[PDB]
Amino acid sequence: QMMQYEWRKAELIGQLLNLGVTPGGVLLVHSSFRSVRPLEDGPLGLIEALRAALGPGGTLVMPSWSGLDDEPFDPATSPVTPDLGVVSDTFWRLPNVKRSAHPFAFAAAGPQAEQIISDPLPLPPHSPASPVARVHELDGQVLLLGVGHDANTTLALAELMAKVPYGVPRHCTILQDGKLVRVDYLENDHCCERFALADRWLKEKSLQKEGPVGHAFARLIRSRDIVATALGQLGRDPLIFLHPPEAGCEECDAARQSI
Ligand SMILES: CN[C@@H]1[C@@H](O)[C@@H](O[C@@H]2[C@@H](O)[C@H](O[C@H]3O[C@H](CN)CC[C@H]3N)[C@@H](N)C[C@H]2N)OC[C@]1(C)O
Ligand SMILES: [Zn+2]
């Protein structure tokens, strides 16, 4: 890399429309700016383009969780976990952006933002009555921006809706009446590598639009299409996302013992 094209706002809008983003809808965005860059206006230019594509009637949504099990969450100050990217960390600090008030936070901006983020602490994080399920309920679109289905949180929601038989102990920390309270729960967590199987599943039914957004390979799928397709596979095999024991994956092995 050396003298690469720095996409302007109008071009990014065109790439988003050409990919299938429709005005006035709900759009959940997972992004890796390292794949998107360089843009003319940096990470902020990507957010501005996403919102200009959705128009004033649409709602931009992004993950916003802190990734910290032992610290309480503050929607006004808690940084997002570094694994979510700089765009998610910057998005929630912008004006009029709403954020959920629990460590498994999402952020949203638009006429439907508070229908998406105004739920209390969900257990498990991606259960119903959580932001990722509200996006599914609101029939929104999911856009992966330089990341694969290993970052498609909607697939973890599909795992729960299938009542998948694995669940490992996890915990977070909240502030109740001024004292730090830890909250233990069971999460359907593994290595997430085999989430990539959704590529072939969704493409075989022609449910995944692909194209460039900036410099990144972008995948655009409906939330209902992600859940329905994943449920169809989990209905054939609930352990489809876990590595076989021969693979030696520690985390998937831990999920297998939890059954
Ligand atoms: C906030 N609680 C979290 C807990 O929810 C969990 O979150 C997992 C995360 O650890 C996994 O991370 C796993 O996969 C990563 C790459 N995708 C690499 C690291 C691996 N442990 C994610 N794949 C799925 C999350 N829901 O990670 C442990 C934790 C920090 O206690
Ligand atoms: Zn694994």
Author numbering: -1 to 257
Give sentences copied directly from the paper behind this entry.
Here, we conduct a comprehensive functional analysis of the Antibiotic_NAT family of aminoglycoside acetyltransferases. AG resistance is primarily conferred by three classes of aminoglycoside-modifying enzymes (AMEs): phosphotransferases (APHs), nucleotidylyltransferases (ANTs), and acetyltransferases (AACs). The fold typical of the Antibiotic_NAT family is evident in all structures, composed of 13 α-helices and 8 β-strands, and determined structures superpose with pairwise RMSD’s 0.8–1.0 Å between 197 to 266 matching Cα atoms.
To understand the structural basis of the highly promiscuous nature of group 1 Antibiotic_NAT enzymes, we pursued structural characterization of the AAC(3)-IVa representative of this clade in complex with AG substrates. To increase the chances of capturing substrate-bound enzyme complex we used the catalytically impaired His154Ala mutant of AAC(3)-IVa. Using this strategy, we were able to determine the crystal structures of AAC(3)-IVa enzyme in complex with gentamicin or apramycin to 2.6 and 2.8 Å, respectively. In both complex structures, the electron density corresponding to the AG molecule localized to the cleft between the major and minor subdomains of the enzyme. In the complex structures, the gentamicin molecule spans across the enzyme’s minor subdomain while the apramycin molecule is twisted nearly 90° relative to gentamicin. Additionally, Glu185 appears to be a critical residue for interactions with gentamicin and apramycin as it positions the 2-deoxystreptamine ring for modification through interactions with the 1-N of gentamicin or the 5-hydroxyl of apramycin. In the complex structure, gentamicin’s 5-OH pointed out of the enzyme’s active site. If similarly oriented, 4,5-disubstituted AGs would not cause a steric clash with this enzyme’s active site.
